[PDB]
Amino acid sequence: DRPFKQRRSFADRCKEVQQIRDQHPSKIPVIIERYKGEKQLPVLDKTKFLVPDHVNMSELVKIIRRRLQLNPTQAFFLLVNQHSMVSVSTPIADIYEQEKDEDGFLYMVYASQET
Ligand SMILES: CCc1ccc2[nH]c(C)c(CC(=O)O)c2c1
Ligand SMILES: CCc1ccc2[nH]c(C)c(CC(=O)O)c2c1
Question: How does DSSP classify residue 91?
Answer without folding.
Answer: B
